[PDB]
Amino acid sequence: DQADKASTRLKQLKRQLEEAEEEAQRANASRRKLQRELEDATETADAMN
Amino acid sequence: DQADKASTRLKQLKRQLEEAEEEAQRANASRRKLQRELEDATETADAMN
Amino acid sequence: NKAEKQKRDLGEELEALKTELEDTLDSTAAQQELRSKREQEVNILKKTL
């Protein structure tokens, strides 16, 4: 029963790890677009100066 | 052995899940900080026009 | 009977370490083939002896 209970809980953690990895990929992807937009604004600020 | 092996893998997943959650805080916090800088660029764009 | 029981118990320790290292045996196929053949030869020598 301990092995079955531990195995069941272990599989449940895999679902959280898989879902957590998707959040990091989506969150990291948003940073790429955010940094890209900020980079364009930095060049515009330097040109305006 | 299966319970100990499964329990050992469960502990490894716990530290891995905590590491991913900890990294998400830095990425999530950085995303909020980047949003604040983006707001300044948007407001500055209005004054530039 | 107790001696034979201890032998089976000691053998389980070797199987436990092998199962925990099975994830790395596949990646090390460059040398696992030669090492695996040597293990079988030792078992044949014990049976023949």
Side-chain angles (χ1 to χ4, degrees), chain C residues 8-36:
Chain C
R8 289 156 178 165
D9 294 348
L10 288 163
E12 287 187 22
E13 291 275 42
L14 290 162
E15 289 185 10
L17 295 178
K18 287 180 173 183
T19 59
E20 290 191 342
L21 295 166
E22 288 181 353
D23 296 340
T24 72
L25 303 183
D26 287 347
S27 181
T28 322
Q31 64 179 304
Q32 183 65 221
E33 280 287 5
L34 298 180
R35 182 261 183 171
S36 61

PDB file of all heavy atoms in Angstrom, chain C residues 8-36:
ATOM      1  N   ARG C   8      19.331 -14.471  -0.399  1.00  0.00           N
ATOM      2  CA  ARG C   8      18.304 -13.826  -1.212  1.00  0.00           C
ATOM      3  C   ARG C   8      18.126 -12.367  -0.817  1.00  0.00           C
ATOM      4  O   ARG C   8      17.914 -11.505  -1.678  1.00  0.00           O
ATOM      5  CB  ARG C   8      16.981 -14.584  -1.084  1.00  0.00           C
ATOM      6  CG  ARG C   8      16.973 -15.939  -1.773  1.00  0.00           C
ATOM      7  CD  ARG C   8      15.932 -16.862  -1.163  1.00  0.00           C
ATOM      8  NE  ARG C   8      15.882 -18.153  -1.838  1.00  0.00           N
ATOM      9  CZ  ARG C   8      15.290 -19.233  -1.348  1.00  0.00           C
ATOM     10  NH1 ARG C   8      14.681 -19.214  -0.172  1.00  0.00           N
ATOM     11  NH2 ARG C   8      15.307 -20.360  -2.054  1.00  0.00           N
ATOM     12  N   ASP C   9      18.210 -12.067   0.482  1.00  0.00           N
ATOM     13  CA  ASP C   9      18.091 -10.684   0.928  1.00  0.00           C
ATOM     14  C   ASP C   9      19.262  -9.843   0.433  1.00  0.00           C
ATOM     15  O   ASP C   9      19.076  -8.694   0.014  1.00  0.00           O
ATOM     16  CB  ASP C   9      17.996 -10.630   2.452  1.00  0.00           C
ATOM     17  CG  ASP C   9      16.728 -11.270   2.980  1.00  0.00           C
ATOM     18  OD1 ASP C   9      15.818 -11.544   2.170  1.00  0.00           O
ATOM     19  OD2 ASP C   9      16.641 -11.499   4.205  1.00  0.00           O
ATOM     20  N   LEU C  10      20.476 -10.398   0.473  1.00  0.00           N
ATOM     21  CA  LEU C  10      21.636  -9.666  -0.022  1.00  0.00           C
ATOM     22  C   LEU C  10      21.533  -9.423  -1.522  1.00  0.00           C
ATOM     23  O   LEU C  10      21.952  -8.372  -2.021  1.00  0.00           O
ATOM     24  CB  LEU C  10      22.919 -10.425   0.314  1.00  0.00           C
ATOM     25  CG  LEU C  10      23.344 -10.423   1.785  1.00  0.00           C
ATOM     26  CD1 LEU C  10      24.351 -11.529   2.056  1.00  0.00           C
ATOM     27  CD2 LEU C  10      23.912  -9.067   2.177  1.00  0.00           C
ATOM     28  N   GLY C  11      20.979 -10.388  -2.261  1.00  0.00           N
ATOM     29  CA  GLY C  11      20.817 -10.208  -3.693  1.00  0.00           C
ATOM     30  C   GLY C  11      19.866  -9.083  -4.045  1.00  0.00           C
ATOM     31  O   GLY C  11      20.027  -8.430  -5.080  1.00  0.00           O
ATOM     32  N   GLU C  12      18.864  -8.838  -3.196  1.00  0.00           N
ATOM     33  CA  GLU C  12      17.930  -7.748  -3.455  1.00  0.00           C
ATOM     34  C   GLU C  12      18.627  -6.395  -3.408  1.00  0.00           C
ATOM     35  O   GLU C  12      18.216  -5.460  -4.105  1.00  0.00           O
ATOM     36  CB  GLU C  12      16.780  -7.790  -2.450  1.00  0.00           C
ATOM     37  CG  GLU C  12      15.789  -8.919  -2.689  1.00  0.00           C
ATOM     38  CD  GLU C  12      14.575  -8.829  -1.787  1.00  0.00           C
ATOM     39  OE1 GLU C  12      14.287  -7.721  -1.284  1.00  0.00           O
ATOM     40  OE2 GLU C  12      13.906  -9.863  -1.579  1.00  0.00           O
ATOM     41  N   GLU C  13      19.677  -6.267  -2.593  1.00  0.00           N
ATOM     42  CA  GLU C  13      20.410  -5.006  -2.529  1.00  0.00           C
ATOM     43  C   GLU C  13      21.070  -4.686  -3.865  1.00  0.00           C
ATOM     44  O   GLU C  13      21.083  -3.528  -4.297  1.00  0.00           O
ATOM     45  CB  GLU C  13      21.452  -5.062  -1.411  1.00  0.00           C
ATOM     46  CG  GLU C  13      20.860  -5.076  -0.011  1.00  0.00           C
ATOM     47  CD  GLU C  13      20.570  -3.684   0.513  1.00  0.00           C
ATOM     48  OE1 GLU C  13      20.057  -2.850  -0.263  1.00  0.00           O
ATOM     49  OE2 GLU C  13      20.854  -3.423   1.700  1.00  0.00           O
ATOM     50  N   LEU C  14      21.622  -5.701  -4.531  1.00  0.00           N
ATOM     51  CA  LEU C  14      22.239  -5.476  -5.835  1.00  0.00           C
ATOM     52  C   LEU C  14      21.197  -5.083  -6.875  1.00  0.00           C
ATOM     53  O   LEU C  14      21.455  -4.222  -7.725  1.00  0.00           O
ATOM     54  CB  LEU C  14      23.000  -6.726  -6.279  1.00  0.00           C
ATOM     55  CG  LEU C  14      24.276  -7.056  -5.503  1.00  0.00           C
ATOM     56  CD1 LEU C  14      24.676  -8.506  -5.721  1.00  0.00           C
ATOM     57  CD2 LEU C  14      25.405  -6.117  -5.904  1.00  0.00           C
ATOM     58  N   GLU C  15      20.016  -5.701  -6.825  1.00  0.00           N
ATOM     59  CA  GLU C  15      18.961  -5.353  -7.771  1.00  0.00           C
ATOM     60  C   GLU C  15      18.424  -3.950  -7.521  1.00  0.00           C
ATOM     61  O   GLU C  15      18.051  -3.253  -8.472  1.00  0.00           O
ATOM     62  CB  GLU C  15      17.829  -6.377  -7.695  1.00  0.00           C
ATOM     63  CG  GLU C  15      18.183  -7.737  -8.273  1.00  0.00           C
ATOM     64  CD  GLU C  15      17.004  -8.692  -8.282  1.00  0.00           C
ATOM     65  OE1 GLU C  15      15.871  -8.241  -8.013  1.00  0.00           O
ATOM     66  OE2 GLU C  15      17.211  -9.892  -8.558  1.00  0.00           O
ATOM     67  N   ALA C  16      18.375  -3.521  -6.258  1.00  0.00           N
ATOM     68  CA  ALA C  16      17.895  -2.176  -5.957  1.00  0.00           C
ATOM     69  C   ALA C  16      18.815  -1.118  -6.548  1.00  0.00           C
ATOM     70  O   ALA C  16      18.349  -0.142  -7.149  1.00  0.00           O
ATOM     71  CB  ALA C  16      17.764  -1.992  -4.444  1.00  0.00           C
ATOM     72  N   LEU C  17      20.131  -1.292  -6.391  1.00  0.00           N
ATOM     73  CA  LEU C  17      21.072  -0.335  -6.960  1.00  0.00           C
ATOM     74  C   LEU C  17      21.047  -0.359  -8.482  1.00  0.00           C
ATOM     75  O   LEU C  17      21.276   0.674  -9.121  1.00  0.00           O
ATOM     76  CB  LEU C  17      22.484  -0.620  -6.447  1.00  0.00           C
ATOM     77  CG  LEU C  17      22.712  -0.438  -4.946  1.00  0.00           C
ATOM     78  CD1 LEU C  17      24.141  -0.796  -4.570  1.00  0.00           C
ATOM     79  CD2 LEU C  17      22.384   0.986  -4.521  1.00  0.00           C
ATOM     80  N   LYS C  18      20.773  -1.522  -9.078  1.00  0.00           N
ATOM     81  CA  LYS C  18      20.712  -1.606 -10.533  1.00  0.00           C
ATOM     82  C   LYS C  18      19.484  -0.886 -11.076  1.00  0.00           C
ATOM     83  O   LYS C  18      19.570  -0.178 -12.088  1.00  0.00           O
ATOM     84  CB  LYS C  18      20.715  -3.070 -10.975  1.00  0.00           C
ATOM     85  CG  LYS C  18      22.057  -3.764 -10.813  1.00  0.00           C
ATOM     86  CD  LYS C  18      21.986  -5.213 -11.263  1.00  0.00           C
ATOM     87  CE  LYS C  18      23.362  -5.859 -11.269  1.00  0.00           C
ATOM     88  NZ  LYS C  18      23.319  -7.256 -11.782  1.00  0.00           N
ATOM     89  N   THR C  19      18.334  -1.051 -10.420  1.00  0.00           N
ATOM     90  CA  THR C  19      17.122  -0.378 -10.876  1.00  0.00           C
ATOM     91  C   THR C  19      17.264   1.136 -10.779  1.00  0.00           C
ATOM     92  O   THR C  19      16.826   1.866 -11.677  1.00  0.00           O
ATOM     93  CB  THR C  19      15.916  -0.856 -10.065  1.00  0.00           C
ATOM     94  OG1 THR C  19      16.131  -0.575  -8.676  1.00  0.00           O
ATOM     95  CG2 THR C  19      15.711  -2.352 -10.249  1.00  0.00           C
ATOM     96  N   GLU C  20      17.871   1.625  -9.697  1.00  0.00           N
ATOM     97  CA  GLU C  20      18.068   3.061  -9.540  1.00  0.00           C
ATOM     98  C   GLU C  20      19.043   3.628 -10.563  1.00  0.00           C
ATOM     99  O   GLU C  20      19.005   4.833 -10.836  1.00  0.00           O
ATOM    100  CB  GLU C  20      18.558   3.374  -8.125  1.00  0.00           C
ATOM    101  CG  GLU C  20      17.513   3.155  -7.043  1.00  0.00           C
ATOM    102  CD  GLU C  20      17.939   3.715  -5.700  1.00  0.00           C
ATOM    103  OE1 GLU C  20      19.150   3.960  -5.513  1.00  0.00           O
ATOM    104  OE2 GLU C  20      17.063   3.910  -4.831  1.00  0.00           O
ATOM    105  N   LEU C  21      19.911   2.793 -11.130  1.00  0.00           N
ATOM    106  CA  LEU C  21      20.879   3.228 -12.129  1.00  0.00           C
ATOM    107  C   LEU C  21      20.489   2.833 -13.545  1.00  0.00           C
ATOM    108  O   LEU C  21      21.277   3.045 -14.472  1.00  0.00           O
ATOM    109  CB  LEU C  21      22.266   2.668 -11.799  1.00  0.00           C
ATOM    110  CG  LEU C  21      22.913   3.170 -10.507  1.00  0.00           C
ATOM    111  CD1 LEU C  21      24.105   2.304 -10.130  1.00  0.00           C
ATOM    112  CD2 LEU C  21      23.327   4.628 -10.643  1.00  0.00           C
ATOM    113  N   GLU C  22      19.297   2.264 -13.741  1.00  0.00           N
ATOM    114  CA  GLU C  22      18.880   1.870 -15.082  1.00  0.00           C
ATOM    115  C   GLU C  22      18.707   3.077 -15.995  1.00  0.00           C
ATOM    116  O   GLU C  22      18.840   2.950 -17.218  1.00  0.00           O
ATOM    117  CB  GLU C  22      17.581   1.065 -15.014  1.00  0.00           C
ATOM    118  CG  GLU C  22      17.750  -0.338 -14.455  1.00  0.00           C
ATOM    119  CD  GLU C  22      16.447  -1.114 -14.427  1.00  0.00           C
ATOM    120  OE1 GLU C  22      15.391  -0.516 -14.726  1.00  0.00           O
ATOM    121  OE2 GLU C  22      16.478  -2.319 -14.105  1.00  0.00           O
ATOM    122  N   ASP C  23      18.410   4.249 -15.427  1.00  0.00           N
ATOM    123  CA  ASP C  23      18.241   5.441 -16.249  1.00  0.00           C
ATOM    124  C   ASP C  23      19.543   5.848 -16.927  1.00  0.00           C
ATOM    125  O   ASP C  23      19.514   6.466 -17.997  1.00  0.00           O
ATOM    126  CB  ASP C  23      17.706   6.594 -15.397  1.00  0.00           C
ATOM    127  CG  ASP C  23      16.322   6.315 -14.845  1.00  0.00           C
ATOM    128  OD1 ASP C  23      15.622   5.443 -15.401  1.00  0.00           O
ATOM    129  OD2 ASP C  23      15.933   6.967 -13.853  1.00  0.00           O
ATOM    130  N   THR C  24      20.686   5.513 -16.329  1.00  0.00           N
ATOM    131  CA  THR C  24      21.982   5.846 -16.902  1.00  0.00           C
ATOM    132  C   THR C  24      22.589   4.716 -17.721  1.00  0.00           C
ATOM    133  O   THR C  24      23.520   4.965 -18.493  1.00  0.00           O
ATOM    134  CB  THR C  24      22.969   6.244 -15.797  1.00  0.00           C
ATOM    135  OG1 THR C  24      23.344   5.082 -15.046  1.00  0.00           O
ATOM    136  CG2 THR C  24      22.338   7.264 -14.861  1.00  0.00           C
ATOM    137  N   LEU C  25      22.088   3.487 -17.571  1.00  0.00           N
ATOM    138  CA  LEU C  25      22.634   2.371 -18.337  1.00  0.00           C
ATOM    139  C   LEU C  25      22.341   2.525 -19.823  1.00  0.00           C
ATOM    140  O   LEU C  25      23.163   2.147 -20.667  1.00  0.00           O
ATOM    141  CB  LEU C  25      22.074   1.050 -17.811  1.00  0.00           C
ATOM    142  CG  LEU C  25      22.299   0.760 -16.326  1.00  0.00           C
ATOM    143  CD1 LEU C  25      21.765  -0.616 -15.960  1.00  0.00           C
ATOM    144  CD2 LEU C  25      23.773   0.879 -15.973  1.00  0.00           C
ATOM    145  N   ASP C  26      21.175   3.078 -20.165  1.00  0.00           N
ATOM    146  CA  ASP C  26      20.831   3.261 -21.572  1.00  0.00           C
ATOM    147  C   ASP C  26      21.727   4.304 -22.229  1.00  0.00           C
ATOM    148  O   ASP C  26      22.165   4.123 -23.372  1.00  0.00           O
ATOM    149  CB  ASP C  26      19.361   3.653 -21.707  1.00  0.00           C
ATOM    150  CG  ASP C  26      18.422   2.492 -21.445  1.00  0.00           C
ATOM    151  OD1 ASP C  26      18.897   1.338 -21.402  1.00  0.00           O
ATOM    152  OD2 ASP C  26      17.207   2.735 -21.280  1.00  0.00           O
ATOM    153  N   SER C  27      22.011   5.401 -21.525  1.00  0.00           N
ATOM    154  CA  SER C  27      22.868   6.439 -22.089  1.00  0.00           C
ATOM    155  C   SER C  27      24.303   5.956 -22.255  1.00  0.00           C
ATOM    156  O   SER C  27      24.995   6.386 -23.183  1.00  0.00           O
ATOM    157  CB  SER C  27      22.827   7.691 -21.212  1.00  0.00           C
ATOM    158  OG  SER C  27      23.627   8.722 -21.761  1.00  0.00           O
ATOM    159  N   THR C  28      24.764   5.070 -21.375  1.00  0.00           N
ATOM    160  CA  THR C  28      26.122   4.532 -21.436  1.00  0.00           C
ATOM    161  C   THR C  28      26.194   3.235 -22.229  1.00  0.00           C
ATOM    162  O   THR C  28      26.872   2.286 -21.822  1.00  0.00           O
ATOM    163  CB  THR C  28      26.662   4.330 -20.023  1.00  0.00           C
ATOM    164  OG1 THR C  28      26.218   5.404 -19.183  1.00  0.00           O
ATOM    165  CG2 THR C  28      28.183   4.297 -20.035  1.00  0.00           C
ATOM    166  N   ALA C  29      25.505   3.164 -23.370  1.00  0.00           N
ATOM    167  CA  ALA C  29      25.524   1.951 -24.179  1.00  0.00           C
ATOM    168  C   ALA C  29      26.861   1.737 -24.873  1.00  0.00           C
ATOM    169  O   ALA C  29      27.121   0.632 -25.364  1.00  0.00           O
ATOM    170  CB  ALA C  29      24.401   1.991 -25.214  1.00  0.00           C
ATOM    171  N   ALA C  30      27.716   2.762 -24.927  1.00  0.00           N
ATOM    172  CA  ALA C  30      29.012   2.606 -25.577  1.00  0.00           C
ATOM    173  C   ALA C  30      29.883   1.602 -24.836  1.00  0.00           C
ATOM    174  O   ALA C  30      30.656   0.861 -25.457  1.00  0.00           O
ATOM    175  CB  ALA C  30      29.715   3.959 -25.677  1.00  0.00           C
ATOM    176  N   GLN C  31      29.776   1.560 -23.508  1.00  0.00           N
ATOM    177  CA  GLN C  31      30.552   0.638 -22.694  1.00  0.00           C
ATOM    178  C   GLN C  31      29.704  -0.344 -21.900  1.00  0.00           C
ATOM    179  O   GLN C  31      30.257  -1.299 -21.345  1.00  0.00           O
ATOM    180  CB  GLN C  31      31.459   1.410 -21.723  1.00  0.00           C
ATOM    181  CG  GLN C  31      30.705   2.247 -20.703  1.00  0.00           C
ATOM    182  CD  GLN C  31      31.630   2.974 -19.746  1.00  0.00           C
ATOM    183  OE1 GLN C  31      32.462   2.356 -19.080  1.00  0.00           O
ATOM    184  NE2 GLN C  31      31.490   4.292 -19.674  1.00  0.00           N
ATOM    185  N   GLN C  32      28.385  -0.141 -21.827  1.00  0.00           N
ATOM    186  CA  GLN C  32      27.541  -1.064 -21.077  1.00  0.00           C
ATOM    187  C   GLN C  32      27.497  -2.443 -21.725  1.00  0.00           C
ATOM    188  O   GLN C  32      27.334  -3.449 -21.027  1.00  0.00           O
ATOM    189  CB  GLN C  32      26.127  -0.495 -20.948  1.00  0.00           C
ATOM    190  CG  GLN C  32      25.189  -1.352 -20.113  1.00  0.00           C
ATOM    191  CD  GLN C  32      25.619  -1.445 -18.662  1.00  0.00           C
ATOM    192  OE1 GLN C  32      25.548  -2.509 -18.049  1.00  0.00           O
ATOM    193  NE2 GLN C  32      26.071  -0.326 -18.107  1.00  0.00           N
ATOM    194  N   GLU C  33      27.642  -2.510 -23.051  1.00  0.00           N
ATOM    195  CA  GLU C  33      27.624  -3.801 -23.732  1.00  0.00           C
ATOM    196  C   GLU C  33      28.807  -4.660 -23.305  1.00  0.00           C
ATOM    197  O   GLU C  33      28.651  -5.847 -23.001  1.00  0.00           O
ATOM    198  CB  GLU C  33      27.619  -3.593 -25.246  1.00  0.00           C
ATOM    199  CG  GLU C  33      26.257  -3.246 -25.822  1.00  0.00           C
ATOM    200  CD  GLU C  33      25.311  -4.431 -25.838  1.00  0.00           C
ATOM    201  OE1 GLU C  33      25.684  -5.498 -25.306  1.00  0.00           O
ATOM    202  OE2 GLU C  33      24.195  -4.295 -26.382  1.00  0.00           O
ATOM    203  N   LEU C  34      30.006  -4.072 -23.280  1.00  0.00           N
ATOM    204  CA  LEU C  34      31.185  -4.824 -22.863  1.00  0.00           C
ATOM    205  C   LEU C  34      31.126  -5.165 -21.379  1.00  0.00           C
ATOM    206  O   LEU C  34      31.509  -6.269 -20.975  1.00  0.00           O
ATOM    207  CB  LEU C  34      32.453  -4.032 -23.184  1.00  0.00           C
ATOM    208  CG  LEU C  34      32.709  -3.733 -24.663  1.00  0.00           C
ATOM    209  CD1 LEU C  34      33.990  -2.935 -24.836  1.00  0.00           C
ATOM    210  CD2 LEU C  34      32.761  -5.021 -25.471  1.00  0.00           C
ATOM    211  N   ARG C  35      30.650  -4.231 -20.553  1.00  0.00           N
ATOM    212  CA  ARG C  35      30.549  -4.498 -19.122  1.00  0.00           C
ATOM    213  C   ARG C  35      29.463  -5.527 -18.828  1.00  0.00           C
ATOM    214  O   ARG C  35      29.621  -6.365 -17.933  1.00  0.00           O
ATOM    215  CB  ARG C  35      30.278  -3.198 -18.364  1.00  0.00           C
ATOM    216  CG  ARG C  35      30.193  -3.365 -16.856  1.00  0.00           C
ATOM    217  CD  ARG C  35      28.749  -3.437 -16.387  1.00  0.00           C
ATOM    218  NE  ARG C  35      28.650  -3.527 -14.935  1.00  0.00           N
ATOM    219  CZ  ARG C  35      27.516  -3.437 -14.254  1.00  0.00           C
ATOM    220  NH1 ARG C  35      26.357  -3.251 -14.864  1.00  0.00           N
ATOM    221  NH2 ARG C  35      27.545  -3.533 -12.928  1.00  0.00           N
ATOM    222  N   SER C  36      28.354  -5.478 -19.570  1.00  0.00           N
ATOM    223  CA  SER C  36      27.284  -6.446 -19.357  1.00  0.00           C
ATOM    224  C   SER C  36      27.738  -7.859 -19.703  1.00  0.00           C
ATOM    225  O   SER C  36      27.386  -8.819 -19.009  1.00  0.00           O
ATOM    226  CB  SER C  36      26.055  -6.061 -20.180  1.00  0.00           C
ATOM    227  OG  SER C  36      26.348  -6.061 -21.566  1.00  0.00           O
TER     228      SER C  36
END
